[PDB]
Amino acid sequence: WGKDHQVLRLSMENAVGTVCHPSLMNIDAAVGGVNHDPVEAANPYGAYV
Amino acid sequence: YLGRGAPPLLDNAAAVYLRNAVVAGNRLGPAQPLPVFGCAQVPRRAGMD
Amino acid sequence: HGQDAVCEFIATPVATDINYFRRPCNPRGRAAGGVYAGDKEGDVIALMY
Secondary structure, eight states: OOGGGOOOOOOSGGGHHHHTSTTTTOOHHHHHHTTSSOOOOOOOSTTOO | OOSOOOOOOSSHHHHHHHHHHHSSSOSSSOSSOOOSSSOOOOOOOSBOO | OOSOOOOOOOOOOTTSOTTTTSSSOOTTSSOOOSSSBOOSSSOTTTSOO
């Protein structure tokens, strides 16, 4: 109920401004920011072609 | 799409296709493009309750 | 019983939810008031149509 006791609704077509913007595909800050302090061998089985 | 902090989609058709699919009628949606220097200019509506 | 009142019918989509109707709302479908106008000149008559 919004202000005024009006019963309201959101749903998920409502998230199109957030997740349908090309911020979803931008991770370069993440992949570089987790890169530092290198990590051990990961048993590159499913990790290697 | 009211700000710019996002490197866009690399297909320029994809970018403009999705921008104005989202931005089409949004209550926040930019009135005129996001000026390079300027305010994002949320449209003002004839009335509010 | 008293002065006969007069009912009037505005054809509406059957698929208009009952919730816009479980409230004081406007019979036409949209707020027409000049109470809501922003006094930005043409607000009322934009506020409406």
